[PDB]
Each structure stands twice: as structure tokens, then as C-alpha cells.
């Protein structure tokens, strides 16, 4: 059995960086009250074998958009955020909602986040016609809030991601001007754990907490 | 090879970790857009690679951190040391400043990996003095770390460079390490075939002047 108080066990949970952002304040802190002692720990799903990890128990839950987990895996659908553009308050040009016109217009700081369900927004742009001016390049999002903070470039980035970032760095969002898919986030479990007492628990948890 | 700031459409290719480059393109962005308006920015992590034989070949530009893999063939340039501290939220009902190594041991931790980094090595040596935190969060980078301060009463071990780029935004504050850790040391490196690009010398020049202590 499981109980969720006096459980000292540890769970493993697999997520991207924006993830890992939005999910771990909320989770510690429903966790406080629920499972004061057990522990948790995350890895990047890239981090190296999901697929054969969650299935030999390792990995516990993986979270986000994840085409490669097909067999073997359970996935129940938490919620869908879209892309919106990412600007400082005091922008000296930008406006909200910003058009498609101003969006070429202003420079940008681009995130590869290669092999995620963000790093498909380059090509889309691209194909669409929309050439940018990208002055910087990164591969993450942790600098994003900053240089967004003191600079006048702006950015495309996912909307959980500007719900924790726009009043810790004073940065505004807007609408996006471009025709972008809804990037769908999903939580994922191995069959083998399907009605193992923990992991029904934890996911359980995760519904509640961020189901829409 | 000539370069010229003003009108330069160039690429530079910079290596560093998510501490360095939350910490480094802020302000390096933000001097490019007066002084290298045309000029590109791309960043990438010293271990996404073959990171020596990609600055011999020259594309990768520059390297910053602690890479004590880079000795023969790289000219290296001291930017700071910093210190570890205790990061918690302002309003944290029982961590003071100055924390006590005893205090330190009673509160629950959220520890980073860093893995392959400097700062993957704070684990071991807390170890080591006997110190067995309480670790109820371990995440592999430093990127959740401000939010979950912000919205947690757990205490973080942190780069006082990493600190500083959160304490306001997220409503926290540090106080200065009971342990006893080392402090870490940033530098700049370039490979030897380009002491001499201009373009290397002039963004490598740039560094020094912006981030040397």
C-alpha cells in the first residue's frame, strides 16, 4: 500500500525547464501537507533513456509533449498553453497586442529548446514567411526573464513560462501575432506502474493540481 | 579577419553554463545593442560538444567558467570569484542571516545537480563535514530555483552571482555560508590560433571590461 504521509519514498519525475518552473512550486507545496517526507527529484527527459527508465521504475511520471513515449505508455492530457510575445513593461516600441508588422520589425532572443515541443516554433516561423532578427540565441529559458528585463528585444515563449515570469522581471505579454500551434502538455506513466499504489497517487495529485 | 563593431553582421559562438549565461548576456546584450549593433549572439554548454576541438577550429569563440579541462593551447583571463550563500525568501519563517551551520542542518533543502560542473561538488563536501542536509527537492539546474524559494520554506546552497539575479525579482535574500566551501573561480578562455583575430580580441576585450572584479 501507500500512504502519502508517512511515505519516505523518493519519486523521480522527468519534465523541460519550463515545466520544471510551473510544476515544482505548486507541487512542494501541496506536498507539504500531503507527504511531508518523501522526496523529490527531476531530470531533463533528454537526459538520457525515459523510455527504458520509467519502465524499469527509475523515472516515475515524464511531463510534456513526448511522441516517442507511443507503447507501453499511459498518457492523460493536462492542459494546452500557447505562445505569446514577451517584452519589457517599459518598452520604448512594443505595443499589445503586438502585430505582425512591429514582430519583424523588433529584435529577438531565440530559444533553440531543441528535441521539446518548443524548439518546432523556428521552422513554423520560418515557413510562414516571418524573417526575425534574431541578436541572440540561446538553448534554455532560464536567462530569458533577464534579458528580457534590460533590453528592448522580444521573445517568443510559452505562456506557462510568461505566468512566471512577468512580475518577477517586470516584462509584459501579448497575444501572438502569428498563426502558432497549441503546444499540448501530457502526463505520462509506464503500464507497468498503472495501479502501483504510489504512482496512481502522485498522478493523481498532478491532475488535481493542473488539469484544466 | 578585419572587424569592425559598427558594421560587423558576424557570429560569435559562446560557451557557458545557465548560471554564467543568466549572469553574462544580460549586460553583454545590452552593451551590443550601442556598441556591435549587427552582430549575433549564440551561447551553448561547454559540455554539449567536443568543446577543445571546436575552439581550435574557431567555432566556438569564447569559453567562461571553471573548464579545468582547458590548460595547453588556451589563453585564459580571470573575470571573479564568488562565493556560495544560503538562498531563502525574505519572509522565511525561521532562516536568519547570519545562518547557523546548526539552523542550516534542521531546515529542508533544494539541492542542484550541476552535474559535470563546479557546483556539483558542494554536495560531496557537506558530506564530508559530517552535515547530512535534508534534501526534499533535487533538480538537475538552477532555473526553478528562484520560484520555488518564492513560494516554499526551503533553503537553497547558491552562487552569489546566481543570488543576485534572483533576490529582487523573486523576493528573497541570502545569507553567507556556515559551511565551510571553497569559492569559485570564473575566467575567460580562448584558444591560442585566435590571440590575434581582432574580432575574438575586440568581444574577448568586452568581457573583461564588463564582468572583470
Redesign the interface.
Known amino acids: 500500500s501507500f500512504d502519502p504521509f508517512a511515505s519516505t519514498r523518493t519519486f523521480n519525475l522527468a519534465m523541460t525547464?519550463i515545466g520544471?518552473?510551473y510544476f515544482?512550486?505548486?507541487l512542494?507545496?501541496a506536498l507539504?501537507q500531503r507527504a511531508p517526507h518523501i522526496?523529490?527529484?527531476?531530470?531533463?527527459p533528454n537526459?538520457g533513456n525515459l523510455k527504458e527508465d520509467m519502465e524499469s521504475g527509475a523515472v516515475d511520471l515524464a511531463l510534456g509533449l513526448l511522441p516517442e513515449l507511443q507503447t507501453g505508455f499511459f498518457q492523460r492530457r493536462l492542459f494546452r498553453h500557447r505562445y505569446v510575445c514577451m517584452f519589457r513593461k517599459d518598452h520604448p516600441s512594443a505595443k499589445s497586442p503586438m502585430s505582425l508588422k512591429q514582430f519583424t520589425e523588433l529584435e529577438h532572443?531565440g530559444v533553440v529548446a531543441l528535441n521539446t515541443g518548443h524548439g518546432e516554433v523556428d521552422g513554423l516561423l520560418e515557413r510562414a514567411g516571418i524573417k526575425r532578427r534574431?541578436?541572440?540565441?540561446?538553448?534554455?529559458?532560464?536567462?530569458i526573464?533577464?534579458?528580457l528585463?534590460?533590453?528592448?528585444?522580444i521573445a517568443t515563449v510559452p505562456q506557462r513560462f510568461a505566468v512566471?515570469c512577468e512580475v518577477?522581471?517586470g516584462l509584459t505579454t501579448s497575444p501572438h501575432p502569428a498563426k502558432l500551434p497549441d503546444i499540448a502538455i501530457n502526463l505520462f506513466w509506464h503500464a507497468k506502474y498503472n495501479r502501483d499504489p504510489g504512482n496512481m497517487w502522485l498522478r493523481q495529485l498532478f491532475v488535481e493540481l493542473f488539469s484544466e
Open positions: 525547464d520544471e518552473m515544482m512550486p505548486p512542494m507545496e507539504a522526496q523529490i527529484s527531476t531530470l531533463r537526459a532572443v534574431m541578436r541572440l540565441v540561446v538553448p534554455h529559458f532560464i536567462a526573464g533577464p534579458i528585463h534590460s533590453t528592448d528585444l512566471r518577477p522581471f
